[PDB]
Design a protein around this nucleic acid. Structure first.
Lengths: 293, 55, 168, 157, 206
RNA sequence: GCGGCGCGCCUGCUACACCGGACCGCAGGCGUCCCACGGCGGGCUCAGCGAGGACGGAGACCUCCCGCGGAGCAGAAGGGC
RNA sequence: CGGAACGGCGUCGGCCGGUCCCGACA
RNA sequence: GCCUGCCCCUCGCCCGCCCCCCAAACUCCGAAGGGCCGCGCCGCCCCGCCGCUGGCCUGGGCGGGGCGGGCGAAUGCGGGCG
RNA sequence: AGUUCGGCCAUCCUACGGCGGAAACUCCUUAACUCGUUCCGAAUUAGGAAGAGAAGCGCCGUCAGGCCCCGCCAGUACUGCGAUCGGAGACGUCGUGGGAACACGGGGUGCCGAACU
């Protein structure tokens, strides 16, 4: 009972290393292909994929166009920007996704608009003025002359579970003005019978947190202290959540322009490579450790 | 009666006698097989303004 | 002299396995036995291929399994060590720190012997996981766990000794 | 050959190389194509639709039509004593852009630039034609100490 | 009678080996390819003598078995089984074919003629190149006098002209009489067993 | 020569590195099958190397782990995943 | 002196070697 | 070496290590030799047309006008077309 | 520095042992909900933020396997076209052209873009 080894030089010689992104697993190559296959006739005309990545403490939205090398991140808004816009806590809930979306969309429409400096873009496409759950497809209506900037959705590798955070970021961009192809069946409240404005009007307002916060205080205040600690110090009571969301949405739509925040580039020690002549020496000392003993 | 089958001997000389004739300019850029939309764009655009084959 | 608190050991899950060929309704009868103990619906695994010695024929349900975790896992496994007199064979611990034992009588686990439910033997296998193993199962960022963090059988026997005061 | 399928005698040709098995690098689909671009054709088994017949492998051609999801390469094939302008439709993956006149595109601009510098300073024009190597010159070489070479015996073998 | 060996002499056809397309390969007569003291110390057998191949040719297996039997006997009778190592280096691999013409001929009766000439495999045969060693006899000092004779007594059995050579190499070991010895004082020769290799400077230290 | 069918068709050879290349030359198939064995979207990883676990061993199940495909994709073979 | 495996103190050459003016038991 | 004493030996298998010789329907690699296309028209500035494109003032095509230039491998020879 | 979207796909891998985190990331953290699980919040979804470098990940090792480069192999094997060259043949030379491969040493161990902190 003593067996063969899988990692033979034969296995290694034939190993076909996957693409660096595929090995890491961040990017699914098959979807990227279908999202980025611009029909050849158009040529240079660029294609926008609305990446909505999800992370433990942040939700990242950026509108991107893939050139032969760069992915040309056009304009980007992340969850960490939202406390500046007035939401102190809950920077990764469904409601915060519908805000991350307005943050990206309204920045994109204005950035294109200031360069245009004419009767175009945001004045042509204010979009839904307020955050409401009604179905709104921006390009479905007039779409006169300058068409709404349409970007296709990139769910990443995350799974399209009914009413996931990533779906609600898409609504946020749609609220801003960017037409993003959508059906809203995934959105909660879309029973085959109908789309519930309510299921969206409440989740977009962060009332999912409100039910739990109030219930937690009654059944077990001590758990509610540990579970929602940041919410308590911030003073956003479950009742106050609705007001916070309306104000933030109002500020986001009116003044999207982002301001630069400074970054400190700390350098880790990064003990450098041992010099090659010294590298041979380490074996030479070891040889003495075996010979002289 | 048993007979010969197939052999290309001499076929090369026959072909290269005066052969290797270029396919001709008319079929170098012919409109057969082109995008149907491209053809309609080219014809409609040429008609307006300078190439007014129209009356 | 303190290990990082993530280096603790947790019972990730317990598998429960029966192999009642297929008979006429025996697999359904074991479904009743598994349902009460784990409070879960046991899923019927299926026979692969058709063999001569047993009666599997590439489609007969041959086994029922449920995976139990957390508080249920501790109690169902603690039952299994009492009925095994807090004694386990030493070699049961495996290469990936996974160990198992055999359970005669579905009744011995405190289930009442029934004329209606005939005795069905089951077997157990408990998987031990070090907090931080998510790197192996997450849909995104799926990468193999490092050597230290993997439970070596020696380390897991120590966690079993500490957890149930068992002997080998 | 008693059988003649559209994939006949393609055991080694249509096979991918040693460690390039897999999806196409995304760059192939993304690259831009302009009508009149030479496109070398390299048949692959990466996808099984849009594969041209084995003869069309390696036949540099120009793109007659930039259709949606496809390209239209016209190649020159030898039949009897006549070159025929066959027009084929390939999916982008099975086709690649060609350097072809890479030297020429650089040559015309570089030669023109030499004239452009010349219009100011550099009144003489360096002859702007390639010369086929040409035959050596004086290159007087110092013998100094030269190793004597003597043919060897049929010994070491 | 297997026919005269001149019928299949010379590498006339492209090597056709025993394979999934080949069926019914008859049987190489020669089944033993190493005779004598196969178990050997590289140190105990200083010189090796080989039979070099005079011409590109095809050598029948029955010859390879026949030669093996005769050459081995002469060293065995004089030098002894202990003093000789005999290696048939060429293996019978190519299987030649033989056309079957038996019984009556005609129309709708037993097929006869050169129509359908592919032959049922017969005579497993060996492929040789000019200069490929056929036989390798390794001996101690004691058999140095009798080694050449054993090779030649059997030379006639091997088809065509051949040559007898003394290896400047020390034994089967690739190294020569000098190199082997240079790496014997310097402790640079791992002894594998029948053969040996230089210790080398590669591999993880421990 | 009707004993065979290279008498339509296909895979790998023979084929002599573009392609085209003969033969009652080799190694084989085809004349069907499947509304799911189809299309699409989602999930998933397969044959197995081990090391473990009532009965339970060559072998049946259930676990992990390493798993470049070593699996199965209706049938010939070769690509391909 | 169509033509081989083998042989040829037939005749001219060459290669790798040992002896022998301590002249090839005196 | 022994009621069974397996207190364990010799050959194997299996796994590591070398070694001898192979493939036409084997290929990590892979020549010679073959194929296929180019070797003069560019650079600039504008301006039209488009029922097409696109978020756009984006494209590509197709034209037209100016300007800065020019014959840009060797050798043979007049090519094509019914 | 670190993340995201990427390009080229091993000098980017695989294995082991160290070293590291401020932020970033991961692990984490639970299930009223939306959802999610041939059974199983393992995964997946939703809602969090008490820990933590132990993994992942980033950095160094290691006569480390591979991968990559240059020698060597070697004018070697082969081979284009010529010889009323030499051979009973098998085949081999010689003229003018080319020119491998495996072993075997010596080294190398990602880089490029776009946005944000």
């Amino acid at each position: 009972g003593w067996v063969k080894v899988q990692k033979t030089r034969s296995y290694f010689k034939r190993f076909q290393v996957q693409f660096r992104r595929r090995r890491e697993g961040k990017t699914d190559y098959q979807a990227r292909k279908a999202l980025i296959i611009q029909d050849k006739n158009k040529y240079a005309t660029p294609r926008y994929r609305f990446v909505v990545r999800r992370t433990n403490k942040d939700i990242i939205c950026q509108v991107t166009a893939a050139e032969l090398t760069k992915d040309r991140v056009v304009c980007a808004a992340y969850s960490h920007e939202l406390p500046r816009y007035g939401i102190p806590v809950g920077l990764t809930n469904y409601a915060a996704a519908y805000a991350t979306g307005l943050l990206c969309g309204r920045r994109l429409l204005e950035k294109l608009s200031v360069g245009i400096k004419e009767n175009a873009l945001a004045q042509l496409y204010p979009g839904l003025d307020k955050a409401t759950g009604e179905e709104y497809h921006p390009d479905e209506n007039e779409n006169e002359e300058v068409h709404a900037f349409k970007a296709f959705l990139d769910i990443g590798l995350a799974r399209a579970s009914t009413g996931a955070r990533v779906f609600a970021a898409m609504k946020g961009a749609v609220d801003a003005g960017l037409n993003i192809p959508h059906s809203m069946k995934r959105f909660p409240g879309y029973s085959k019978d109908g789309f519930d404005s309510s299921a969206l009007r409440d989740r977009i307002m962060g009332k999912h947190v409100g039910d739990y916060m109030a219930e937690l205080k009654a059944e077990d205040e001590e758990t509610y202290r540990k579970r929602f600690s940041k919410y308590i110090a911030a003073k956003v009571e479950p009742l106050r959540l609705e007001a916070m969301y309306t104000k933030a949405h109002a500020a986001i739509r009116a003044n999207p322009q982002a301001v630069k925040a400074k970054f400190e580039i700390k350098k880790p020690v990064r003990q450098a490579r041992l010099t090659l002549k010294e590298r041979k020496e380490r074996i030479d000392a070891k040889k003495l450790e075996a010979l002289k003993q | 009666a048993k007979l010969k089958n197939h052999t290309s001997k001499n076929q090369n000389r026959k072909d290269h006698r005066n052969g290797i004739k270029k396919p001709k300019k008319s079929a170098y850029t012919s409109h057969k097989g082109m995008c149907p939309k491209y053809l309609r764009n080219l014809r409609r655009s040429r008609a307006n303004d300078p190439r007014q084959s129209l009356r | 002299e303190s290990e990082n608190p993530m280096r603790r050991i947790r019972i990730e899950k317990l598998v429960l396995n029966i192999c009642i060929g297929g008979e006429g309704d025996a697999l359904t009868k074991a479904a009743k036995v598994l349902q009460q103990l784990t409070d879960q619906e046991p899923t019927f695994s299926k026979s692969r291929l058709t063999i001569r010695g047993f009666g599997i024929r590439r489609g007969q349900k041959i086994s029922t399994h449920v995976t139990v975790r957390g508080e249920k896992a501790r109690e169902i496994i603690e039952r299994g060590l009492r009925v095994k007199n807090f004694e386990l064979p030493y070699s049961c611990f495996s290469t990936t720190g996974n160990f198992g034992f055999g359970i005669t009588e579905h009744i011995d686990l405190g289930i009442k012997y029934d004329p209606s439910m005939g005795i069905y033997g089951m077997d157990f296998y408990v998987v031990l996981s070090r907090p931080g193993f998510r790197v192996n199962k997450r849909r995104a960022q799926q990468q193999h766990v490092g050597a230290s963090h993997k439970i070596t059988p020696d380390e897991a026997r120590a966690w079993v000794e500490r957890e149930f005061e068992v002997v080998y | 050959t008693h059988s003649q399928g559209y994939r006949c005698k393609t055991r080694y040709c249509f096979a991918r190389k040693f460690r390039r098995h897999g999806m196409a690098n995304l760059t192939t689909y993304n690259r831009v194509y302009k009508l009149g671009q030479y496109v070398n054709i390299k048949v692959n088994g990466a996808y099984h639709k849009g594969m041209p017949h084995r003869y069309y492998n390696g036949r540099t051609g120009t793109i007659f039509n930039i259709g949606p999801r496809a390209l239209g390469v016209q190649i020159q094939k030898r039949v009897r004593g006549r070159i025929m302008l066959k027009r084929i439709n390939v999916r982008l993956e099975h086709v690649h852009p060609s350097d072809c006149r890479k030297n020429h595109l650089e040559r015309v601009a570089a030669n023109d630039a030499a004239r452009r510098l010349a219009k100011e300073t550099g009144q003489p024009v360096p002859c702007l034609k390639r010369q086929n190597a040409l035959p050596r010159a004086a290159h007087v070489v110092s013998i100094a100490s030269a190793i004597d070479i003597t043919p060897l015996k049929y010994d070491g073998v | 009678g297997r026919r005269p060996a001149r019928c299949y002499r010379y590498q006339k056809n492209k090597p056709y080996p025993k394979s999934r397309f080949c069926r019914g390969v008859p049987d190489p007569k020669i089944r033993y390819f190493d005779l004598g003291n196969r178990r050997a110390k590289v140190n105990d057998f200083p010189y090796c003598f080989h039979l070099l191949s005079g011409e590109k040719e095809q050598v029948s297996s029955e010859a390879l078995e026949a030669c093996r039997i005769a050459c081995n006997k002469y060293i065995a009778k004089k030098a002894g089984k202990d003093s000789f190592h005999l290696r048939i280096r060429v293996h019978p691999f190519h299987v030649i074919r033989i056309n079957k013409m038996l019984s009556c001929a005609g129309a709708d009766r037993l097929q006869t003629g050169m129509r359908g000439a592919w032959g049922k495999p017969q005579g497993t045969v060996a492929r040789v190149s000019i200069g490929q060693p056929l036989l390798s006899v390794r001996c101690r000092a004691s058999a140095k006098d009798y080694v050449k004779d054993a090779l030649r007594r059997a030379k006639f059995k091997i088809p065509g002209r051949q040559a007898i050579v003394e290896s400047r190499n020390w034994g089967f070991t690739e190294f020569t009489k000098e190199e082997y010895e240079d790496l014997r004082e310097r402790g640079e020769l791992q002894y594998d067993g029948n053969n040996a290799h230089r210790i080398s400077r590669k591999g993880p230290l421990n």
